[PDB]
């Protein structure tokens, strides 16, 4: 109903139908076309007809170059104000901030950032009004999961950008099956906006909008919706990527009994034919997708990936911790990405793959730092900051955050099980982080309890102190910038799952690939020859006696690690405990857990600091 002719936007609608929406679905579109006054309504389908209609208009529109080297792959260049998520423009709405962060004992929680309703409907208010104005408002109807899976949520992503429709069809399963799946069931409501209405009232750079002044990526957990504004980019766009996968879903997994965490999971194989799903938690620039995919050196052992980012995990009835993959793509890290490093991820990129602010070839290929491979004589290079650019010139051809955007069944060693609806079996979990003193290659945790302390113990190098300097941080869990809630209360989580009738709790590791010499020389050869460690891991989820106790936990025993090949390592020095650096380590990780978490820090969290400590002091 209607006085007018302003709240029905029907004649509006250029692909598909406001009529053959659900009910919920329909409310959700058609209130925010009325907020946002888009020009159109493009109700998404996921074909392949779609897609490549999409490219090639953004090609038209110069937002897009196509990479002429390559099979159906693509190039974006951004306004260099938006290459990144932005966490201190990321917030959590709640009732209550202790709700979203432990409210810390003397400092500012670097746990998350609450804002408040009032603050948050203000910034709402000043933001949405108008802002689709002269485009088009895509619907994006998504799983985050294998469609029919009982461990699968359905989003909707309203977006006024091309870039992120193309995107999501890569990293989720979207389109009319996903529409039809939903009906009248419940859904996470996604609402983008670049925030660069028509006509334009500041300049476009590089044909890419985005509004960096007023840039907001909000989850409001309690009214199941996600809301971002002014930038385009990745995980503050694609609001599948973190924004669901992690923040609300940790909330729903806290409220529903299960997990949702920063983890890769994989498949191994050894060579007796039995094989194992193990997943991992590692901080930024530590090689998640290079484990996730990694070409094992050891003959007769395979790894094949299911996923590099994301894991929902759920105790089944029968005990077992299942786990999927929710996303449909990788979005990795190009800088760093060559055959030494991840000769799977090289494979898979070749083609229908979306690249954001990597460098140009003459001959429409893509160049990144790390990728370690030579060009011919002739071939020229266009940084991503679309001018040209030599070696030897001292700022990088690639924008370190610079990413690549490709379909998971492209990948050569994708798990046979990676879209299976009941998940797959995790039998470890490993933790890690860039520690390049004092932590051995890898440590196995004494029981459940003392593996959620090492958890929330991890702390690992930055990228720098941001003029130079190291700075050792903390990442709990890897979960630091993602936490969809009060990190003691998903402390509390974690621990109660070993109180879960018939519970199979997973071996609990740390792995620590980045230990270096006196002299800053890495001590471990890593990449392919990390399956040595992931065959250590193997055989202790096996029972094997393959063990010996430390103060810190359990380490490889005397001739235990396979080095058949490696020549000499030195595994004195890689997996050294010296009571100085630990009796150190034990009190940063004090401090931080009394600051960061203090009244919601659980007693067993709190009980395991005192057993560390404990056992140091006997050293
Ligand atoms: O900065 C961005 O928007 C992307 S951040 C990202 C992308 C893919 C997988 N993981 C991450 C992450 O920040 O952990
Ligand atoms: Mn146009
Ligand atoms: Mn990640
Ligand atoms: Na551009």
Redesign the pocket.
């Known amino acids: 109903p209607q006085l007018h002719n302003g709240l029905d936007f029907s004649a509006k609608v250029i692909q598909g139908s406001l009529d053959s929406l659900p009910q919920e679905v329909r409310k959700f579109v058609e209130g925010n076309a009325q907020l946002c006054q888009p020009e159109y309504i493009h109700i998404c389908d996921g074909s392949e007809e779609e897609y490549g209609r999409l490219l090639a208009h953004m090609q038209e529109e110069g937002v897009i170059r196509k990479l002429k080297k390559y099979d159906n792959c693509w190039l974006a260049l951004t306004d260099p104000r938006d ?3 932005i966490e201190s423009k990321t917030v959590i709405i709640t009732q209550e901030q202790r709700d979203t962060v432990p409210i810390p004992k003397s400092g500012q929680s670097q746990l998350g950032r609450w804002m408040s309703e009032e603050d948050f409907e203000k910034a709402f208010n000043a933001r949405f009004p108008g802002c689709m104005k002269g485009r088009t408002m895509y619907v994006i109807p998504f799983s985050m999961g294998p469609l029919g899976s009982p461990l699968a949520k359905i989003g909707i992503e309203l977006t006024d950008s091309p870039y992120v429709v193309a995107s999501m069809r890569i990293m989720t399963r979207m389109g009319t099956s996903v529409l039809e799946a939903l009906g009248d069931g419940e859904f996470i409501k996604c609402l983008h906006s670049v925030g660069c209405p028509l006509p334009l009232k500041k300049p476009l750079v590089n044909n890419w909008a985005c509004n960096p002044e007023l840039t907001l990526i909000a989850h409001l957990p309690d009214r199941r919706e996600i809301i971002s504004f002014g ?1 385009g ?6 609001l599948g ?2 924004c669901f996968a992690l923040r609300i879903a940790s909330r729903l997994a806290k409220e529903e009994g299960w997990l949702a965490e ?1 983890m890769l999971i994989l498949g191994i194989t050894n060579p007796e034919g039995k094989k194992k799903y193990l997943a991992a938690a590692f ?2 620039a530590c090689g ?2 290079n484990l996730a995919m990694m070409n094992p050196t050891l003959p007769g052992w395979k790894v094949e990936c299911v996923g ?2 994301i894991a929902w995990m759920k105790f089944d009835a029968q005990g077992n911790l299942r786990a999927i993959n929710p996303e449909n793509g ?4 190009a800088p760093g990405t060559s055959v030494k490093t991840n000769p799977n991820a090289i494979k898979t990129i070749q083609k229908n793959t979306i690249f954001t602010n990597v460098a140009e070839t003459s001959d429409g290929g893509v160049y990144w730092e790390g990728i370690d491979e030579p060009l011919a004589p002739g071939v020229t290079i266009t940084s991503w900051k679309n001018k040209e650019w030599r070696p030897q010139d001292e700022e990088p051809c690639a924008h370190p ?1 610079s ?1 690549f955007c490709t379909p998971a069944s492209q990948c050569p060693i994708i798990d046979p099980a990676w879209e299976s609806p009941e998940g797959v079996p995790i039998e470890g979990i490993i933790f890690g982080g860039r520690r390049p003193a004092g932590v051995p290659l890898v440590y196995e945790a004494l029981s459940w309890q003392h593996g959620v302390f090492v958890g929330a113990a991890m702390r690992s190098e930055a990228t720098a102190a941001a003029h130079k300097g190291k700075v050792i941080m903390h990442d709990p869990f ?1 979960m630091r ?2 936490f969809g809630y009060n990190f003691g209360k998903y402390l509390a989580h974690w621990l109660s799952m070993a109180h879960r009738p018939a519970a199979k709790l997973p071996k609990i590791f740390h792995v620590n690939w980045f230990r270096k010499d006196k002299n800053g020389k890495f001590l471990w050869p890593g990449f392919g020859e990390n399956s040595r460690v992931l065959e250590w891991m193997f055989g202790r989820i096996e029972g094997e006696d393959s063990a010996k106790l430390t103060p810190i936990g359990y380490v490889p025993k005397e001739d235990a690690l396979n080095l058949k090949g490696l020549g000499d390592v030195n595994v004195e020095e890689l997996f050294g405990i010296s009571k100085e650096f630990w009796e150190k380590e034990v009190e940063e990780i004090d401090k931080y857990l009394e600051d960061q978490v203090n009244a919601d820090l659980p007693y067993e969290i709190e009980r395991e600091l005192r057993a560390l400590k404990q056992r140091i002091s006997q050293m």
């Open positions: 290459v990144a998520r930038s980019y990745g995980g503050n766009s694609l990527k973190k920063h901080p930024s998640k997708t590099d980012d990788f979005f990795g890290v955050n990413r890897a910038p993602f």
